[PDB]
Amino acid sequence: CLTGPRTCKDLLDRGHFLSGWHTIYLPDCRPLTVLCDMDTDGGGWTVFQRRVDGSVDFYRDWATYKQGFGSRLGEFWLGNDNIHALTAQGTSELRTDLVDFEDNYQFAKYRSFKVADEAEKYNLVLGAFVEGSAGDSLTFHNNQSFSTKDQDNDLNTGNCAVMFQGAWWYKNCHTSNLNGRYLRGTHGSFANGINWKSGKGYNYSYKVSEMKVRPA
Amino acid sequence: GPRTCKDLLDRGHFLSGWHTIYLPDCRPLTVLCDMDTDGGGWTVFQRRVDGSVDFYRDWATYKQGFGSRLGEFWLGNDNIHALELRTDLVDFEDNYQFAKYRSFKVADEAEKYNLVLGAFVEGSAGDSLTFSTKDQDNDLNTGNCAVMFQGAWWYHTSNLNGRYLRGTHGSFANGINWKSGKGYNYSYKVSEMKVRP
Amino acid sequence: PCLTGPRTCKDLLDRGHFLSGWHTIYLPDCRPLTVLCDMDTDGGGWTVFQRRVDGSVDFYRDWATYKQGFGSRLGEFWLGNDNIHALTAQGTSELRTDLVDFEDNYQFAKYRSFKVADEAEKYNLVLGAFVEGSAGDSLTFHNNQSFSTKDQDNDLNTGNCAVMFQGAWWYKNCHTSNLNGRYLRGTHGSFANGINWKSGKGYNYSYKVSEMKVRPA
Numbered sequence: 001c002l003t004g005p006r007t008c009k010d011l012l013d014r015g016h017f018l019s020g021w022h023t024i025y026l027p028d029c030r031p032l033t034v035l036c037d038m039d040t041d042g043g044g045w046t047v048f049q050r051r052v053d054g055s056v057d058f059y060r061d062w063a064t065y066k067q068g069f070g071s072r073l074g075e076f077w078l079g080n081d082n083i084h085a086l087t088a089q090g091t092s093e094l095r096t097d098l099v100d101f102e103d104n105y106q107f108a109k110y111r112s113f114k115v116a117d118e119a120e121k122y123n124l125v126l127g128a129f130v131e132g133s134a135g136d137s138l139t140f141h142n143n144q145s146f147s148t149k150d151q152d153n154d155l156n157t158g159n160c161a162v163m164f165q166g167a168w169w170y171k172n173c174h175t176s177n178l179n180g181r182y183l184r185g186t187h188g189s190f191a192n193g194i195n196w197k198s199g200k201g202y203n204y205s206y207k208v209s210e211m212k213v214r215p216a
Numbered sequence: 217g218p219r220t221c222k223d224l225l226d227r228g229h230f231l232s233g234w235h236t237i238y239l240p241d242c243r244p245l246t247v248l249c250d251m252d253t254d255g256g257g258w259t260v261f262q263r264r265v266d267g268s269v270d271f272y273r274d275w276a277t278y279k280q281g282f283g284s285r286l287g288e289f290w291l292g293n294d295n296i297h298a299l300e301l302r303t304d305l306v307d308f309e310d311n312y313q314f315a316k317y318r319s320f321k322v323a324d325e326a327e328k329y330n331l332v333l334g335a336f337v338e339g340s341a342g343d344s345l346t347f348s349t350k351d352q353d354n355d356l357n358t359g360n361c362a363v364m365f366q367g368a369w370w371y372h373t374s375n376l377n378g379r380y381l382r383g384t385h386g387s388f389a390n391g392i393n394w395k396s397g398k399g400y401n402y403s404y405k406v407s408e409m410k411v412r413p
Numbered sequence: 414p415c416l417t418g419p420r421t422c423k424d425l426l427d428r429g430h431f432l433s434g435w436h437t438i439y440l441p442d443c444r445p446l447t448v449l450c451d452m453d454t455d456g457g458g459w460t461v462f463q464r465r466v467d468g469s470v471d472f473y474r475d476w477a478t479y480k481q482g483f484g485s486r487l488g489e490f491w492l493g494n495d496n497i498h499a500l501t502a503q504g505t506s507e508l509r510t511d512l513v514d515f516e517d518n519y520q521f522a523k524y525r526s527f528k529v530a531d532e533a534e535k536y537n538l539v540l541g542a543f544v545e546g547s548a549g550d551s552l553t554f555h556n557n558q559s560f561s562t563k564d565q566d567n568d569l570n571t572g573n574c575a576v577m578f579q580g581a582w583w584y585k586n587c588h589t590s591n592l593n594g595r596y597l598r599g600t601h602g603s604f605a606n607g608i609n610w611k612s613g614k615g616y617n618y619s620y621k622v623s624e625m626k627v628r629p630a
């Protein structure tokens with residue numbers, strides 16, 4: 001542990017050049033098998049969310065988002081407890097990678113990203129937007145509690161997670177909804193897909209979504 | 217150490233994927249755990265997904281197991297013996313169906329891996345299950361079956377080790393078929409057979 | 414660890430690992446390397462160093478990237494020229510190339526020995542006799558050539574083969590195989606810039622699956 005890899009970036013520095021699932025040791029020494037992206041933007045990113053085919057249901061409850069769900073073989077959410085543990089020491093960059101159904105790639109990159117602990121409802125703490133073809137659709141959500149269908153912490157009199165079939169740091173309501181429904185390209189329905197407002201908008205659900213972190 | 221995928225789930229392993237468990241005799245085995253289906257903690261012993269793996273194999277091959285962690289496999293008759301049953305099915309339009317049985321077991325090679333099933337509990341895919349290889353004649357129905365329907369099974373109304381024919385096919389009952397599901401002329405996109413304490 | 418660990422995928426097969434998948438082996442210098450073992454094909458025990466299956470990975474990469482390796486354990490990859498040299502530098506490894514088209518037809522080629530030289534020798538291909546194979550022999554043509562990438566032209570053409578055929582290979586003047594070419598999905602009108610094996614499906618058909626793999630012989 002004290003001499004073991006603590007991030008995907010550590011692994012890259014130690015000559016692990018292929019993306020895939022590797023064990024790392026969290027700050028408290030807990031081992032955790034995580035997906036490393038060793039290619040994108042210099043490589044060494046720890047991936048905490050992945051959408052690619054709609055095989056996994058993301059419309060899930062608080063407990064499920066807390067612990068994590070999905071499959072190493074495809075789509076997953078790494079889990080709110082784990083994402084907190086990964087980001088708690090304050091200085092990881094965030095990258096969001098998005099691909100549409102014509103294989104057009106867009107991204108957003110943020111200077112810092114953290115979620116707080118469960119007691120603080122996994123509050124989003126987001127640093128400055130640095131750049132990205134996808135534009136900034138996350139700053140809007142800064143300093144907001146995470147919400148799921150069964151724990152509404154949003155700023156709407158109704159339930160955002162239900163209204164947009166997802167789980168997110170909803171306010172009233174969103175400009176991004178990456179845990180929304182896998183609706184496959186253009187959809188008439190308003191904003192309930194894998195949507196990034198400044199990217200492809202409220203009526204286009206991406207083919208691929210990945211959210212990932214790396215020591216700044 | 218963990219003895220089942222249910223044990224791994226209990227220990228905080230929440231994502232499906234390959235994990236090592238310890239069989240009743242302490243022999244380590246890396247198995248696929250389904251942590252997301254129906255409560256989770258299932259050990260998957262058969263999987264079809266892309267037709268990348270040849271399932272028309274002989275006795276020794278089904279005995280020891282074959283395929284790939286990257287996709288399709290048969291965990292192996294020796295392993296499956298050492299280890300409720302659920303069958304999960306998906307068509308090329310991404311429609312999900314399933315079955316479920318109260319008990320499931322296979323005997324050793326002396327018993328020639330005789331199937332010891334149980335009661336059909338439920339399942340949208342319906343009931344089509346209530347061992348023979350191409351080089352081991354054991355069929356129920358006289359003559360041959362494995363060679364006839366190009367698979368390996370307890371020879372049928374189901375044929376999950378059949379050919380990956382990809383959806384509707386003209387040939388008869390020789391694909392990944394489940395009578396009560398899509399019939400003898402439709403081969404599933406995805407098939408999985410899994411167990412749990 | 415290295416004292417008792419497997420040194421090849423063949424060792425793993427012998428120890429009772431019957432499913433293909435990623436396993437750690439120990440290189441001749443004790444360096445551990447997680448490699449993909451093919452335990453299914455032709456007796457099993459093969460170490461896979463190249464895999465194409467879905468076009469998710471860009472193979473049009475520079476010398477540095479080919480040297481260290483790139484791609485994903487989840488699908489497509491090039492294990493890396495330094496690793497391939499390490500794996501084949503000593504003893505005799507045979508080579509098998511497995512190819513699948515989009516109509517489910519499987520072809521292969523098998524070679525008696527296969528070695529890539531070190532970086533100073535530009536990862537020179539040292540290939541033994543063609544043994545057999547439904548894909549025909551489209552690699553002997555490339556024996557005793559340097560590896561070339563878009564940024565490192567070591568080929569025998571007055572132009573840049575890597576750029577012209579959008580890949581990285583032991584290009585001559587220029588090629589009969591191009592398995593690191595673009596994932597063009599079957600028939601393509603562009604000339605010889607896909608995952609092509611001339612004696613197999615020709616210069617205008619890019620395979621669905623390509624695997625290159627080695628085993629002690």
Ligand SMILES: *[C@@H]1O[C@H](CO[C@@H]2O[C@@H](C)[C@@H](O)[C@@H](O)[C@@H]2O)[C@@H](O[C@@H]2O[C@H](CO)[C@@H](O[C@@H]3O[C@H](CO[C@H]4O[C@H](CO)[C@@H](O)[C@H](O)[C@@H]4O)[C@@H](O)[C@H](O)[C@@H]3O)[C@H](O)[C@H]2NC(C)=O)[C@H](O)[C@H]1NC(C)=O
Pocket residue numbers: 534537557558559567
């Ligand atoms: C592999 O191919 C090389 C040439 O190809 C280059 O090197 C290889 C390793 C790859 O990296 C390729 O990409 C390169 O393009 C062959 O080398 C030639 O071999 C022939 C004999 O088969 C040599 O011809 C002889 O030359 C003798 C003089 O040798 C010295 O002087 C020459 C220049 O005249 C010089 O080139 C050579 O290296 C020596 O310094 C001569 O006495 C004799 O009569 C005969 O003609 C030829 O010179 C070599 N060329 C080169 C460029 O070295 C390898 O033999 C071949 N190996 C195998 C296993 O087939």
Ligand SMILES: [Ca+2]
Pocket residue numbers: 152153154155156157158159160
């Ligand atoms: Ca509300």
Ligand SMILES: [Ca+2]
Pocket residue numbers: 566567568569570571572573574
């Ligand atoms: Ca040239």
